């Protein structure tokens, strides 16, 4: 794929405007494609291990944010990046791989669940870094501020 | 949800750093949550009509970018915002609702498929605008530039 047809989409929206900007529609298109792009790149570090995005997200969330006893399914969702129909069965699934366990509830990593994340984490941190490499200091800070500001507007 | 635990996640990553920035990980988290937020807001204009995101995207793509005969399944994906397992059966599904049709192939809207988009479009353009309202000129332009630049880095 390329960004060679961005002007084609822009002019396509102009035709629709008989009687004045396509910025919003193009920005959301780009954000949508960015998400998919980021998705393919991030999964590379955990695909080989048989995990999908939703599974990975839960495990890493436990790894960085779960206290020794674990996180209540509520606070667990509040601390995870992904939330939605994608995580409709992530818990049950992970329990079945013995990567997490219960404590009634309360979820937390099992010795292997943690072993896996420890081994993958270096590769995740790398991809995470690489993926944002094209930008740079302050560019990444501003992106952070805007996404936060936009996201803040919708979280009301 | 709120952005009240962003510092908690940041400090959580710091603990992991025994021996130096969490920006990348927090920026991608924010981008991930932004996508879900945007997803819930955009669907409001088409949910009542029984369409999901993948169905809507195809229809709108045809509406703005399909010439009179239609788009070849290839160029159709190149002009659509969404691409992935979500659109694994969007075509077959839409044919079944009689919103699109064939031309052997080649896809295009049917009289109603177009009627629907015409009726929804005003509401979509509104949400699309609203959702980016919190920012402003140049803020939306810069967001566009960065997402494009990042996205450009991954589309290689
Ligand atoms: Cl679009
Ligand atoms: Cl994370």
TrEMBL record, chains A, B:
The keyword Transcription regulation applies. Keywords: DNA-binding, Transcription, Transcription regulation. The keyword Ribonucleoprotein does not apply. Residues 24-152 form the HTH marR-type domain. GO terms for biological process: regulation of DNA-templated transcription; response to stress. InterPro entries: HTH_MarR-typ, WH-like_DNA-bd_sf, WH_DNA-bd_sf. SMART domains: HTH_MARR (SM00347). One of its GO terms (molecular function) is DNA binding. It comes from the Bacteria. PANTHER family: TRANSCRIPTIONAL REGULATOR, MARR, TRANSCRIPTIONAL REPRESSOR OF EMRAB OPERON. This is Transcriptional regulator, MarR family. It comes from Deinococcus radiodurans (strain ATCC 13939 / DSM 20539 / JCM 16871 / CCUG 27074 / LMG 4051 / NBRC 15346 / NCIMB 9279 / VKM B-1422 / R1).
